[PDB]
């Protein structure tokens, strides 16, 4: 039906296993290294567990202006630095 | 705690009550072996 | 039987980021908190 090889025949094929015993660990390792090296925090701007609050303040860094929100976020990140 | 002479088999006891649940799963495994006929 | 089908594309665009994300979430499970 439809001209594609059946899923059962694909997943039971030894060749499918020998391709997918390498690629899947490679992607899993890529994701683990994305989180464990801390690249995800820098890419997505998610605060680290010691980077929610500044050392002196305990005010939540809400952005309050539409066109200065980028500079406001950068100011918060500088004050935690 | 358990009596001390049994303490070396303390991890085994830690997994003992879960064994009947696996029995249920085993039935499906058995049916998977026979093609659910 | 071809390999580079539309089904292959759909399966892999849902499959490759799934494993990347699962590795990411496991590495999250080993964060010290």
């Amino acid at each position: 039906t439809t001209g594609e090889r059946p899923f059962s025949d694909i997943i039971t094929s030894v060749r499918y296993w020998v391709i997918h015993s390498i690629t899947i660990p490679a992607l899993f390792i890529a994701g683990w290294l994305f989180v464990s090296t801390g690249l995800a925090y820098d890419v997505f701007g998610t605060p680290r567990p010691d980077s929610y609050y500044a050392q002196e303040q305990r005010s939540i860094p809400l952005v309050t202006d539409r066109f200065e929100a980028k500079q406001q976020v950068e100011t918060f990140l500088e004050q935690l630095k | 705690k358990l009596p001390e002479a049994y303490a070396i088999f303390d991890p085994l006891v830690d997994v003992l009550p879960v064994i009947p649940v696996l029995f249920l799963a085993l039935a499906f495994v058995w049916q998977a072996a026979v093609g659910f006929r | 039987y071809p390999i580079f089908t539309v089904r292959w594309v759909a399966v892999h665009t849902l499959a490759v980021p799934t494993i990347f994300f699962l590795g990411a979430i496991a590495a999250m499970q080993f964060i010290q908190r």
């Binding site: 059962s8 997943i11 039971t12 094929s13 | 495994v29 | 999250m28 499970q29 080993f30 908190r33």
Partner: peptide
């Protein structure tokens, strides 16, 4: 070839250990 029930059981055990890992991380 590999029997289909072997593949199904292996995938089920893998999904069970990933769920158990997530629940262990939840309780930790």
């Amino acid at each position: 070839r590999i029997p289909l029930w072997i593949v199904a059981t292996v995938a089920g055990m893998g999904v069970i250990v990933i769920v158990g890992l997530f629940f262990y991380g939840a309780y930790a």
